[PDB]
């Protein structure tokens, strides 16, 4: 399965290189042709980065799940970008992880995508 992602300070980018899966960085022209999983980071107060919101307005029909990178020091706003995406588009939250993730976060993501695919 194809993974689409965005990263501002490189933590999500580090995570997706640990997956060894087909992966594409989001941009303004990208149209995705097949089922995909989104990995986003989380902006202040539980939000979705604008570039990701823009991409999803165009690409949500093929979206099959979302994961968020965040930080537990945000409390119940931890990874809430995934909550908002999941609620809006009616897709599962694959996983939440902190920062660039642990090895267990990597393996869990892959097991959950295998289940959804
Ligand atoms: C200004 C700022 C606000 C953030 N707000 C949240 C938040 O509301 N919830 C959360 O879980 N993480 C939050 N984070 C943490 C980031 O989502 C986290 O560092 C993430 O790994 C960044 O991914 P990136 O390095 O790929 O850009 C915030 C980080 C910054 C610098
Ligand atoms: C070409 As890539 C996997 O660093 O987005
Ligand atoms: Zn690379
Ligand atoms: Zn916009
Ligand atoms: Zn917009
Ligand atoms: Zn709260």
PDB file of N, CA and C in Angstrom, residues 20-90:
ATOM      1  N   UNK A  20       9.995   1.369   4.911  1.00  0.00           N
ATOM      2  CA  UNK A  20      10.400   0.671   3.690  1.00  0.00           C
ATOM      3  C   UNK A  20       9.208   0.334   2.775  1.00  0.00           C
ATOM      4  N   UNK A  21       8.188   1.190   2.800  1.00  0.00           N
ATOM      5  CA  UNK A  21       7.002   1.048   1.976  1.00  0.00           C
ATOM      6  C   UNK A  21       6.983   2.077   0.866  1.00  0.00           C
ATOM      7  N   UNK A  22       6.220   1.867  -0.187  1.00  0.00           N
ATOM      8  CA  UNK A  22       6.039   2.902  -1.220  1.00  0.00           C
ATOM      9  C   UNK A  22       5.481   4.150  -0.570  1.00  0.00           C
ATOM     10  N   UNK A  23       6.131   5.291  -0.802  1.00  0.00           N
ATOM     11  CA  UNK A  23       5.812   6.495  -0.063  1.00  0.00           C
ATOM     12  C   UNK A  23       5.993   7.701  -0.977  1.00  0.00           C
ATOM     13  N   UNK A  24       5.107   8.679  -0.825  1.00  0.00           N
ATOM     14  CA  UNK A  24       5.155   9.907  -1.615  1.00  0.00           C
ATOM     15  C   UNK A  24       4.931  11.125  -0.704  1.00  0.00           C
ATOM     16  N   UNK A  25       5.789  12.127  -0.837  1.00  0.00           N
ATOM     17  CA  UNK A  25       5.580  13.405  -0.147  1.00  0.00           C
ATOM     18  C   UNK A  25       4.474  14.182  -0.862  1.00  0.00           C
ATOM     19  N   UNK A  26       3.526  14.671  -0.084  1.00  0.00           N
ATOM     20  CA  UNK A  26       2.435  15.511  -0.569  1.00  0.00           C
ATOM     21  C   UNK A  26       2.988  16.792  -1.174  1.00  0.00           C
ATOM     22  N   UNK A  27       2.367  17.257  -2.262  1.00  0.00           N
ATOM     23  CA  UNK A  27       2.572  18.590  -2.804  1.00  0.00           C
ATOM     24  C   UNK A  27       1.262  19.069  -3.462  1.00  0.00           C
ATOM     25  N   UNK A  28       1.288  20.182  -4.165  1.00  0.00           N
ATOM     26  CA  UNK A  28       0.079  20.929  -4.525  1.00  0.00           C
ATOM     27  C   UNK A  28      -0.466  20.378  -5.803  1.00  0.00           C
ATOM     28  N   UNK A  29       0.311  19.553  -6.472  1.00  0.00           N
ATOM     29  CA  UNK A  29      -0.167  19.051  -7.764  1.00  0.00           C
ATOM     30  C   UNK A  29      -0.476  17.575  -7.719  1.00  0.00           C
ATOM     31  N   UNK A  30      -0.173  16.998  -6.551  1.00  0.00           N
ATOM     32  CA  UNK A  30      -0.222  15.541  -6.524  1.00  0.00           C
ATOM     33  C   UNK A  30      -1.659  15.093  -6.610  1.00  0.00           C
ATOM     34  N   UNK A  31      -2.002  14.198  -7.479  1.00  0.00           N
ATOM     35  CA  UNK A  31      -3.238  13.435  -7.549  1.00  0.00           C
ATOM     36  C   UNK A  31      -2.900  11.966  -7.320  1.00  0.00           C
ATOM     37  N   UNK A  32      -3.438  11.312  -6.320  1.00  0.00           N
ATOM     38  CA  UNK A  32      -3.163   9.914  -6.054  1.00  0.00           C
ATOM     39  C   UNK A  32      -4.281   8.986  -6.578  1.00  0.00           C
ATOM     40  N   UNK A  33      -3.963   8.068  -7.439  1.00  0.00           N
ATOM     41  CA  UNK A  33      -4.439   7.131  -8.362  1.00  0.00           C
ATOM     42  C   UNK A  33      -4.915   5.828  -7.738  1.00  0.00           C
ATOM     43  N   UNK A  34      -4.648   5.681  -6.438  1.00  0.00           N
ATOM     44  CA  UNK A  34      -4.925   4.385  -5.842  1.00  0.00           C
ATOM     45  C   UNK A  34      -5.165   4.572  -4.352  1.00  0.00           C
ATOM     46  N   UNK A  35      -5.656   3.515  -3.704  1.00  0.00           N
ATOM     47  CA  UNK A  35      -5.867   3.564  -2.263  1.00  0.00           C
ATOM     48  C   UNK A  35      -4.573   3.975  -1.552  1.00  0.00           C
ATOM     49  N   UNK A  36      -4.668   4.834  -0.543  1.00  0.00           N
ATOM     50  CA  UNK A  36      -3.474   5.239   0.210  1.00  0.00           C
ATOM     51  C   UNK A  36      -3.797   5.453   1.680  1.00  0.00           C
ATOM     52  N   UNK A  37      -2.753   5.422   2.500  1.00  0.00           N
ATOM     53  CA  UNK A  37      -2.748   5.789   3.898  1.00  0.00           C
ATOM     54  C   UNK A  37      -2.013   7.143   4.030  1.00  0.00           C
ATOM     55  N   UNK A  38      -2.578   8.063   4.765  1.00  0.00           N
ATOM     56  CA  UNK A  38      -1.935   9.351   5.049  1.00  0.00           C
ATOM     57  C   UNK A  38      -1.193   9.317   6.378  1.00  0.00           C
ATOM     58  N   UNK A  39       0.021   9.803   6.446  1.00  0.00           N
ATOM     59  CA  UNK A  39       0.703  10.113   7.701  1.00  0.00           C
ATOM     60  C   UNK A  39       0.940  11.630   7.748  1.00  0.00           C
ATOM     61  N   UNK A  40       0.331  12.282   8.755  1.00  0.00           N
ATOM     62  CA  UNK A  40       0.444  13.680   9.006  1.00  0.00           C
ATOM     63  C   UNK A  40       1.110  13.927  10.364  1.00  0.00           C
ATOM     64  N   UNK A  41       1.658  15.121  10.547  1.00  0.00           N
ATOM     65  CA  UNK A  41       1.983  15.629  11.844  1.00  0.00           C
ATOM     66  C   UNK A  41       0.827  16.499  12.364  1.00  0.00           C
ATOM     67  N   UNK A  42       0.982  17.018  13.574  1.00  0.00           N
ATOM     68  CA  UNK A  42      -0.069  17.759  14.275  1.00  0.00           C
ATOM     69  C   UNK A  42       0.435  19.167  14.601  1.00  0.00           C
ATOM     70  N   UNK A  43      -0.349  20.172  14.205  1.00  0.00           N
ATOM     71  CA  UNK A  43      -0.033  21.558  14.536  1.00  0.00           C
ATOM     72  C   UNK A  43      -0.764  22.013  15.804  1.00  0.00           C
ATOM     73  N   UNK A  44      -0.415  23.200  16.307  1.00  0.00           N
ATOM     74  CA  UNK A  44      -0.859  23.655  17.600  1.00  0.00           C
ATOM     75  C   UNK A  44      -2.360  23.498  17.837  1.00  0.00           C
ATOM     76  N   UNK A  45      -2.700  22.966  18.984  1.00  0.00           N
ATOM     77  CA  UNK A  45      -4.071  22.832  19.464  1.00  0.00           C
ATOM     78  C   UNK A  45      -4.825  21.767  18.660  1.00  0.00           C
ATOM     79  N   UNK A  46      -4.106  20.698  18.296  1.00  0.00           N
ATOM     80  CA  UNK A  46      -4.688  19.519  17.733  1.00  0.00           C
ATOM     81  C   UNK A  46      -5.064  19.558  16.280  1.00  0.00           C
ATOM     82  N   UNK A  47      -4.399  20.421  15.536  1.00  0.00           N
ATOM     83  CA  UNK A  47      -4.802  20.753  14.170  1.00  0.00           C
ATOM     84  C   UNK A  47      -4.022  19.983  13.130  1.00  0.00           C
ATOM     85  N   UNK A  48      -4.602  20.052  11.914  1.00  0.00           N
ATOM     86  CA  UNK A  48      -4.070  19.457  10.702  1.00  0.00           C
ATOM     87  C   UNK A  48      -3.257  20.515   9.940  1.00  0.00           C
ATOM     88  N   UNK A  49      -2.043  20.222   9.496  1.00  0.00           N
ATOM     89  CA  UNK A  49      -1.329  21.246   8.740  1.00  0.00           C
ATOM     90  C   UNK A  49      -2.079  21.647   7.492  1.00  0.00           C
ATOM     91  N   UNK A  50      -2.001  22.935   7.114  1.00  0.00           N
ATOM     92  CA  UNK A  50      -2.769  23.416   5.971  1.00  0.00           C
ATOM     93  C   UNK A  50      -2.456  22.685   4.696  1.00  0.00           C
ATOM     94  N   UNK A  51      -1.203  22.376   4.424  1.00  0.00           N
ATOM     95  CA  UNK A  51      -0.838  21.686   3.182  1.00  0.00           C
ATOM     96  C   UNK A  51      -1.559  20.345   3.107  1.00  0.00           C
ATOM     97  N   UNK A  52      -1.677  19.659   4.238  1.00  0.00           N
ATOM     98  CA  UNK A  52      -2.412  18.376   4.306  1.00  0.00           C
ATOM     99  C   UNK A  52      -3.913  18.572   4.101  1.00  0.00           C
ATOM    100  N   UNK A  53      -4.472  19.609   4.728  1.00  0.00           N
ATOM    101  CA  UNK A  53      -5.915  19.874   4.504  1.00  0.00           C
ATOM    102  C   UNK A  53      -6.214  20.123   3.026  1.00  0.00           C
ATOM    103  N   UNK A  54      -5.343  20.924   2.385  1.00  0.00           N
ATOM    104  CA  UNK A  54      -5.487  21.240   0.958  1.00  0.00           C
ATOM    105  C   UNK A  54      -5.417  19.960   0.071  1.00  0.00           C
ATOM    106  N   UNK A  55      -4.407  19.097   0.365  1.00  0.00           N
ATOM    107  CA  UNK A  55      -4.244  17.850  -0.360  1.00  0.00           C
ATOM    108  C   UNK A  55      -5.483  16.982  -0.198  1.00  0.00           C
ATOM    109  N   UNK A  56      -5.993  16.889   1.027  1.00  0.00           N
ATOM    110  CA  UNK A  56      -7.147  16.019   1.268  1.00  0.00           C
ATOM    111  C   UNK A  56      -8.424  16.554   0.628  1.00  0.00           C
ATOM    112  N   UNK A  57      -8.595  17.875   0.548  1.00  0.00           N
ATOM    113  CA  UNK A  57      -9.783  18.382  -0.132  1.00  0.00           C
ATOM    114  C   UNK A  57      -9.829  17.839  -1.549  1.00  0.00           C
ATOM    115  N   UNK A  58      -8.691  17.594  -2.168  1.00  0.00           N
ATOM    116  CA  UNK A  58      -8.626  17.111  -3.541  1.00  0.00           C
ATOM    117  C   UNK A  58      -8.579  15.589  -3.582  1.00  0.00           C
ATOM    118  N   UNK A  59      -8.049  14.900  -2.581  1.00  0.00           N
ATOM    119  CA  UNK A  59      -7.680  13.493  -2.685  1.00  0.00           C
ATOM    120  C   UNK A  59      -8.345  12.536  -1.748  1.00  0.00           C
ATOM    121  N   UNK A  60      -9.412  12.901  -1.088  1.00  0.00           N
ATOM    122  CA  UNK A  60      -9.984  12.101   0.007  1.00  0.00           C
ATOM    123  C   UNK A  60     -10.678  10.867  -0.495  1.00  0.00           C
ATOM    124  N   UNK A  61     -11.113  10.697  -1.719  1.00  0.00           N
ATOM    125  CA  UNK A  61     -11.877   9.497  -2.062  1.00  0.00           C
ATOM    126  C   UNK A  61     -11.032   8.237  -1.950  1.00  0.00           C
ATOM    127  N   UNK A  62      -9.742   8.337  -2.222  1.00  0.00           N
ATOM    128  CA  UNK A  62      -8.857   7.162  -2.139  1.00  0.00           C
ATOM    129  C   UNK A  62      -8.181   6.993  -0.799  1.00  0.00           C
ATOM    130  N   UNK A  63      -8.479   7.896   0.142  1.00  0.00           N
ATOM    131  CA  UNK A  63      -7.942   7.822   1.501  1.00  0.00           C
ATOM    132  C   UNK A  63      -8.526   6.625   2.241  1.00  0.00           C
ATOM    133  N   UNK A  64      -7.707   5.718   2.785  1.00  0.00           N
ATOM    134  CA  UNK A  64      -8.252   4.543   3.505  1.00  0.00           C
ATOM    135  C   UNK A  64      -7.928   4.524   4.981  1.00  0.00           C
ATOM    136  N   UNK A  65      -7.167   5.506   5.477  1.00  0.00           N
ATOM    137  CA  UNK A  65      -6.774   5.570   6.873  1.00  0.00           C
ATOM    138  C   UNK A  65      -5.794   6.657   7.091  1.00  0.00           C
ATOM    139  N   UNK A  66      -5.619   7.041   8.343  1.00  0.00           N
ATOM    140  CA  UNK A  66      -4.698   8.101   8.711  1.00  0.00           C
ATOM    141  C   UNK A  66      -3.923   7.751   9.974  1.00  0.00           C
ATOM    142  N   UNK A  67      -2.640   8.084   9.999  1.00  0.00           N
ATOM    143  CA  UNK A  67      -1.804   8.071  11.186  1.00  0.00           C
ATOM    144  C   UNK A  67      -1.332   9.494  11.479  1.00  0.00           C
ATOM    145  N   UNK A  68      -1.156   9.792  12.780  1.00  0.00           N
ATOM    146  CA  UNK A  68      -0.578  11.080  13.158  1.00  0.00           C
ATOM    147  C   UNK A  68       0.659  10.902  14.017  1.00  0.00           C
ATOM    148  N   UNK A  69       1.679  11.704  13.684  1.00  0.00           N
ATOM    149  CA  UNK A  69       2.767  12.023  14.588  1.00  0.00           C
ATOM    150  C   UNK A  69       2.341  13.238  15.420  1.00  0.00           C
ATOM    151  N   UNK A  70       2.683  13.206  16.708  1.00  0.00           N
ATOM    152  CA  UNK A  70       2.425  14.321  17.614  1.00  0.00           C
ATOM    153  C   UNK A  70       3.365  14.241  18.806  1.00  0.00           C
ATOM    154  N   UNK A  71       2.853  14.707  19.944  1.00  0.00           N
ATOM    155  CA  UNK A  71       3.605  14.827  21.173  1.00  0.00           C
ATOM    156  C   UNK A  71       2.640  14.708  22.350  1.00  0.00           C
ATOM    157  N   UNK A  72       2.851  13.727  23.248  1.00  0.00           N
ATOM    158  CA  UNK A  72       1.956  13.569  24.377  1.00  0.00           C
ATOM    159  C   UNK A  72       1.965  14.753  25.328  1.00  0.00           C
ATOM    160  N   UNK A  73       2.903  15.679  25.240  1.00  0.00           N
ATOM    161  CA  UNK A  73       2.846  16.853  26.131  1.00  0.00           C
ATOM    162  C   UNK A  73       1.683  17.748  25.708  1.00  0.00           C
ATOM    163  N   UNK A  74       0.952  17.463  24.629  1.00  0.00           N
ATOM    164  CA  UNK A  74      -0.269  18.135  24.219  1.00  0.00           C
ATOM    165  C   UNK A  74      -1.503  17.504  24.809  1.00  0.00           C
ATOM    166  N   UNK A  75      -1.337  16.516  25.694  1.00  0.00           N
ATOM    167  CA  UNK A  75      -2.495  15.968  26.444  1.00  0.00           C
ATOM    168  C   UNK A  75      -3.499  15.331  25.490  1.00  0.00           C
ATOM    169  N   UNK A  76      -4.785  15.666  25.671  1.00  0.00           N
ATOM    170  CA  UNK A  76      -5.809  15.084  24.819  1.00  0.00           C
ATOM    171  C   UNK A  76      -5.873  15.728  23.446  1.00  0.00           C
ATOM    172  N   UNK A  77      -4.957  16.639  23.129  1.00  0.00           N
ATOM    173  CA  UNK A  77      -4.756  17.064  21.766  1.00  0.00           C
ATOM    174  C   UNK A  77      -3.650  16.294  21.056  1.00  0.00           C
ATOM    175  N   UNK A  78      -3.095  15.300  21.711  1.00  0.00           N
ATOM    176  CA  UNK A  78      -2.101  14.401  21.132  1.00  0.00           C
ATOM    177  C   UNK A  78      -2.638  13.753  19.863  1.00  0.00           C
ATOM    178  N   UNK A  79      -1.975  14.041  18.749  1.00  0.00           N
ATOM    179  CA  UNK A  79      -2.335  13.405  17.487  1.00  0.00           C
ATOM    180  C   UNK A  79      -3.725  13.719  17.006  1.00  0.00           C
ATOM    181  N   UNK A  80      -4.325  14.840  17.443  1.00  0.00           N
ATOM    182  CA  UNK A  80      -5.767  15.048  17.157  1.00  0.00           C
ATOM    183  C   UNK A  80      -6.003  15.440  15.716  1.00  0.00           C
ATOM    184  N   UNK A  81      -4.948  15.685  14.955  1.00  0.00           N
ATOM    185  CA  UNK A  81      -5.068  15.785  13.515  1.00  0.00           C
ATOM    186  C   UNK A  81      -5.725  14.519  12.928  1.00  0.00           C
ATOM    187  N   UNK A  82      -5.312  13.333  13.448  1.00  0.00           N
ATOM    188  CA  UNK A  82      -5.902  12.101  12.979  1.00  0.00           C
ATOM    189  C   UNK A  82      -7.387  12.037  13.370  1.00  0.00           C
ATOM    190  N   UNK A  83      -7.770  12.465  14.552  1.00  0.00           N
ATOM    191  CA  UNK A  83      -9.177  12.470  14.936  1.00  0.00           C
ATOM    192  C   UNK A  83     -10.011  13.273  13.962  1.00  0.00           C
ATOM    193  N   UNK A  84      -9.503  14.479  13.635  1.00  0.00           N
ATOM    194  CA  UNK A  84     -10.272  15.332  12.746  1.00  0.00           C
ATOM    195  C   UNK A  84     -10.430  14.740  11.349  1.00  0.00           C
ATOM    196  N   UNK A  85      -9.362  14.179  10.805  1.00  0.00           N
ATOM    197  CA  UNK A  85      -9.401  13.552   9.486  1.00  0.00           C
ATOM    198  C   UNK A  85     -10.305  12.322   9.492  1.00  0.00           C
ATOM    199  N   UNK A  86     -10.140  11.476  10.496  1.00  0.00           N
ATOM    200  CA  UNK A  86     -10.936  10.252  10.616  1.00  0.00           C
ATOM    201  C   UNK A  86     -12.421  10.592  10.710  1.00  0.00           C
ATOM    202  N   UNK A  87     -12.790  11.559  11.530  1.00  0.00           N
ATOM    203  CA  UNK A  87     -14.179  11.965  11.709  1.00  0.00           C
ATOM    204  C   UNK A  87     -14.766  12.551  10.440  1.00  0.00           C
ATOM    205  N   UNK A  88     -14.012  13.438   9.773  1.00  0.00           N
ATOM    206  CA  UNK A  88     -14.508  14.104   8.584  1.00  0.00           C
ATOM    207  C   UNK A  88     -14.747  13.143   7.445  1.00  0.00           C
ATOM    208  N   UNK A  89     -13.736  12.311   7.152  1.00  0.00           N
ATOM    209  CA  UNK A  89     -13.771  11.473   5.974  1.00  0.00           C
ATOM    210  C   UNK A  89     -14.196  10.049   6.248  1.00  0.00           C
ATOM    211  N   UNK A  90     -14.471   9.734   7.505  1.00  0.00           N
ATOM    212  CA  UNK A  90     -14.978   8.393   7.821  1.00  0.00           C
ATOM    213  C   UNK A  90     -14.003   7.274   7.385  1.00  0.00           C
TER     214      UNK A  90
END
